[PDB]
Amino acid sequence: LTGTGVLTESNKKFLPFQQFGRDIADTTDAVRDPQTLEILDITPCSFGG
Amino acid sequence: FNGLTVLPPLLTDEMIAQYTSALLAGTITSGWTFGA
Amino acid sequence: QTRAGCLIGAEHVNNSYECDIPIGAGICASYQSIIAYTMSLGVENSVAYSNNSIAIPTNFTISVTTEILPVSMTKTSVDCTMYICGDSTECSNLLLQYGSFCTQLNRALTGIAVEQDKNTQEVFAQVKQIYKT
Amino acid sequence: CGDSTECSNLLLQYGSFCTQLNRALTGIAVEQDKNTQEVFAQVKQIYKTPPIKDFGGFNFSQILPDPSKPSKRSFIEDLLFNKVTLKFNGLTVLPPLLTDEMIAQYTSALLAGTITSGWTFGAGAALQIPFAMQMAYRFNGIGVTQNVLYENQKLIANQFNSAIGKIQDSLS
Amino acid sequence: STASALGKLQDVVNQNAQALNTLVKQLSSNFGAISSVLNDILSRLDPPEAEVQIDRLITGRLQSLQTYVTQQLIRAAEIRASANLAATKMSECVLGQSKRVDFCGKGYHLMSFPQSAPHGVVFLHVTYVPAQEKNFTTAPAICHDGKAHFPREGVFVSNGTHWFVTQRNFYEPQIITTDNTFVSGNCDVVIGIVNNT
Amino acid sequence: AEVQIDRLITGRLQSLQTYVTQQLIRAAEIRASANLAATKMSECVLGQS
Ligand SMILES: *[C@@H]1O[C@H](CO)[C@@H](O[C@@H]2O[C@H](CO)[C@@H](O)[C@H](O)[C@H]2NC(C)=O)[C@H](O)[C@H]1NC(C)=O
Ligand SMILES: *[C@@H]1O[C@H](CO)[C@@H](O[C@@H]2O[C@H](CO)[C@@H](O)[C@H](O)[C@H]2NC(C)=O)[C@H](O)[C@H]1NC(C)=O
Ligand SMILES: *[C@@H]1O[C@H](CO)[C@@H](O[C@@H]2O[C@H](CO)[C@@H](O)[C@H](O)[C@H]2NC(C)=O)[C@H](O)[C@H]1NC(C)=O
Ligand SMILES: *[C@@H]1O[C@H](CO)[C@@H](O[C@@H]2O[C@H](CO)[C@@H](O)[C@H](O)[C@H]2NC(C)=O)[C@H](O)[C@H]1NC(C)=O
Ligand SMILES: *[C@@H]1O[C@H](CO)[C@@H](O[C@@H]2O[C@H](CO)[C@@H](O)[C@H](O)[C@H]2NC(C)=O)[C@H](O)[C@H]1NC(C)=O
Ligand SMILES: *[C@@H]1O[C@H](CO)[C@@H](O[C@@H]2O[C@H](CO)[C@@H](O)[C@H](O)[C@H]2NC(C)=O)[C@H](O)[C@H]1NC(C)=O
Ligand SMILES: *[C@@H]1O[C@H](CO)[C@@H](O[C@@H]2O[C@H](CO)[C@@H](O)[C@H](O)[C@H]2NC(C)=O)[C@H](O)[C@H]1NC(C)=O
Ligand SMILES: *[C@@H]1O[C@H](CO)[C@@H](O)[C@H](O)[C@H]1NC(C)=O
C-alpha cells in the first residue's frame, strides 16, 4: 500500500483480521504496520495557494 | 482533502449578528426614518 | 389502472381529501392500509353575493409568519495538477499539451467566490452606523 | 446501449454520470410541478358565482365557465386551446400532476372571488360588495374621485363590453 | 418543537456536499483503462502505451471536472437570483412598510424582523388579518333635498332602521353629517340611491 | 469491436450531456418567467397596482 502523508499514533481499534481502515470515499485513514502490528493514523501535510 | 479546498467567508457570523442587531434596534427606536 | 400507469397494492376510494403523496394525472395516495383517490382542491363554498349587501369585519388578529431565504454557499477552490496527476511528472508533462484549460477553470471558481462575498455584503450591509438599544 | 450486455458492462466503468443525469431531469420535473402549483394555487377554498348575475350592466358571459362543455371552460379559453397546435428508445413523457380540469377550476374560483369580494379574499375571508360599488374604489385608487363612475355607469359598461368583444374578434 | 422547518437551507447544504463527494468518488473509475491507480499503471508497463492509459485518465477526469464546474455555475446563478430577492425584501419590508399585495406576509403588512441563519436570512413578518364579519345593507349615495351626497372616506351601512358611514376595515359607525360627505349634482341618474336625511 | 463500441459510447454520452445542459438552461429561464407570472398574479389580480 503506497501513499504519501505524515504518520501519527492512532487509538482506533482494528479487528484482528483487518489490515488498513478508511473513512469515506475510499480514502485510507489508518494503517497497521506489518511488523509490530500497531495501528497508525495518516494525514497529508498541508498544501495551499 | 485531495487538492480541493474550502475558503472562509469574509464576514464571520459574529459581525452578521452585529448587523442584524443594529438593524433591529434601528427599526425599533427610529422606525423607517433611518432608511433615508 | 390510471392515466399515469398501473397501480398495485392500493385500493380505490370514491371520496376526496387533500393530497399526501402525489402520484399523477390528478390522483394521489395516502395511508388510512394505503388508499389511492382523486385530489380535492378544497372546501367549496358559494359567497352570498347580492347587489345591496356588504360584510364589514368587527374584530382583528395579528399574526407572525416566517420566511426563509438562502443567500450564499460555500466557496470552493481546486488545484488541477494535484487533482488530475496526483503529484506525478509524466502526467504533468502530458497535461501540458492540452492547452490552458486550468486558467479558466480556476477563473470561474474565483468569480463564484467573489460573487458569494458580494452577495452577503449587499444583502446585510444596508446600514452605515451601528445603533444600540 | 439498446439492451446489450457488453455495452452495459463497458458503460459500467465510466463512473456515475447517469445517476447525475437522472437526478437533474427529475429535479427539472419536480420544479415544473411545484412551479404550476405556486403560480395557480393561490386560494384556500373554491368559490362559486351566484346563479343569478346582475353585475351593474357588465357582461362576463364570455369569461365565466359554460356548463354545456364537459371541461367547463370559458369561450376564450376554448379559443386559446384550439389556437395552438403541437416513447421509442428511452425517452418518456410524464403527465402533469394537475390536469387541465383543476386548472380551469382554480381559474374559475379566482375569477368568481374577484368578481364578488374584490381584493379582500386574498387577505383573509371574502366579503360581499356590489360590483358597481367596487369599481368606485378602483377609481379612488388612481386619483379619480368616485363621483365619475356613478354618473357614467352605462357608458363604462358599454365600453367594457365592446372591448371584451373586440378582444375575441382579434384573437379568433 | 417541529422539525424539518429549515428545508431550503438544509437542501442547499446537502446539494453542495453531495456534489463534492461524488466529485471525489469519481477518482476511482477506470474510464476504460487497466486500472484507476496511476502509480501501478506507471510501474507495470513502459511509456509507449502507459501514455495512452494516462491519456484516458486525463480525458475522463477533465470531463468530470468540467461537468462539476458547470453545475457550480448554474447553482451560483440560482443563488444569486435568490439573494437579489432577499436584498429587495430586506430593503422594502424591513426599512419601510410595503404596499404591494402578498410580497411579505399574508394580509396587510405592518413590519418585519431579520434574523441570521447559517447560509441565509429568516424574516418574521407581522401582518394584520380581520375577522368576525357581519351583514349590512348599503347604498352608493344619499339623496337629501334632491342632491346626492357621496362619502368622503368610508361606506354607507344600516342595521335595518338607521344609516351610518363607516371605515372600510373595522366596523365603526358614525352619524352622517355634512362634513364627511360631498355633493355632486342632483340625484336622478345614479342607480341605487336611497332616501335619507 | 471494443474500440468501436467505445467510440460510439463516448459520442452518445457527449450528445446526452449537451442535451441535459440545454434543458437546464431552458428550465432556469422558464422558472424566471413563472416567478414573474406568479408575482403578476398576486399583485394585479388580488389587488390594484
Ligand atoms: C518480527 O520479529 C521481531 C523480532 O523479535 C518481533 O519483535 C518482537 O515483538 C514482540 C512482541 O511484539 C516483543 O515482545 C519483542 O520485544 C520484539 N523484539 C524486538 C527485538 O523488538 C516482531 O514482533 C516480529 N513481527 C511479526 C511477528 O509480525
Ligand atoms: C376580539 O378578539 C379577542 C381575541 O382575539 C377578544 O378577546 C377575548 O375576549 C374574551 C371575552 O371578552 C376573553 O374571554 C378572552 O380572554 C379574550 N382574549 C384575549 C386574547 O384577550 C375580544 O373580546 C374580541 N373583541 C371583539 C369586539 O370581538
Ligand atoms: C352577455 O354577453 C353575451 C355574449 O355572447 C350575450 O349573449 C348573446 O346575446 C345576444 C342577444 O340575446 C344573442 O343574439 C347572442 O346569440 C348571444 N350570444 C351567445 C354566445 O349566446 C348575452 O345576451 C349578454 N347578456 C346580457 C345580460 O347583456
Ligand atoms: C349574510 O346573509 C346571507 C344570507 O342569509 C348568509 O348566507 C347564508 O347564511 C345562512 C346562515 O343561516 C346559510 O345557511 C346559507 O347557506 C348562506 N347562503 C349561502 C348561499 O351560502 C351569510 O352567511 C350572512 N353572513 C354572515 C357573516 O352572517
Ligand atoms: C340600530 O342602531 C341604532 C343606533 O345604535 C339603534 O337606535 C337606538 O338603539 C338604542 C340601543 O342601542 C336604543 O336605546 C335607542 O332607543 C335607539 N334609538 C335611538 C333614536 O337612539 C337601533 O335600535 C338599532 N336597530 C337595530 C334593528 O339594530
Ligand atoms: C338589486 O336587485 C334587486 C333584485 O333583482 C332589484 O329589485 C328589483 O327592482 C325593480 C325596480 O327597481 C323591480 O321592478 C323588481 O321587481 C325588483 N326585483 C325583485 C326580485 O324584487 C333592485 O332594483 C336592484 N338594485 C340595484 C341598485 O341594483
Ligand atoms: C324619495 O323622495 C323623493 C322626493 O320626494 C321621491 O320622489 C317623489 O315621489 C313621489 C311619489 O313617488 C312623486 O309624486 C314626486 O313627484 C317625486 N318627486 C319629488 C321631487 O317629490 C321618491 O319617490 C322617494 N323614494 C325614492 C326611492 O326615491
Ligand atoms: C364508487 O361508485 C361507483 C358508482 O357510483 C361504484 O360502482 C363503486 O363500487 C364505488 N366504489 C367505492 C369504493 O365505493
Curated annotation (Swiss-Prot), chain E:
Residues 1-31 are annotated as: Heptad repeat 1. Changing residue 153 to K: In strain: Theta/P.3. Glycans are attached at residues 135, 159, 195. Disulfide bonds join 93-104, 143-187. Changing residue 15 to H: In strain: Omicron/BA.1, Omicron/BA.2, Omicron/BA.2.12.1, Omicron/BA.2.75, Omicron/BA.4, Omicron/BA.5, Omicron/BQ.1.1, Omicron/XBB.1.5, Omicron/EG.5.1. Residues 10-54 form a coiled coil. Changing residue 162 to Y: In strain: Theta/P.3. Changing residue 88 to I: In strain: Gamma/P.1. Subunit of the fusion protein that is processed upon entry into the host cell. Mediates fusion of the virion and cellular membranes by functioning as a class I viral fusion protein. Contains a viral fusion peptide that is unmasked after S2 cleavage. This cleavage can occur at the cell membrane by host TMPRSS2 or during endocytosis by host CSTL. In either case, this triggers an extensive and irreversible conformational change that leads to fusion of the viral envelope with the cellular cytoplasmic membrane, releasing viral genomic RNA into the host cell cytoplasm. This is Spike protein S2'. The lineage of its organism: Viruses, Riboviria, Orthornavirae, Pisuviricota, Pisoniviricetes. The chain holds residues 940 to 1136 of 1273 of the full protein.
Swiss-Prot record, chain F:
The lineage of its organism: Viruses, Riboviria, Orthornavirae, Pisuviricota, Pisoniviricetes. Subunit of the fusion protein that is processed upon entry into the host cell. Mediates fusion of the virion and cellular membranes by functioning as a class I viral fusion protein. Contains a viral fusion peptide that is unmasked after S2 cleavage. This cleavage can occur at the cell membrane by host TMPRSS2 or during endocytosis by host CSTL. In either case, this triggers an extensive and irreversible conformational change that leads to fusion of the viral envelope with the cellular cytoplasmic membrane, releasing viral genomic RNA into the host cell cytoplasm. It comes from Severe acute respiratory syndrome coronavirus 2 (2019-nCoV). This is Spike protein S2'. It comes from the Viruses.
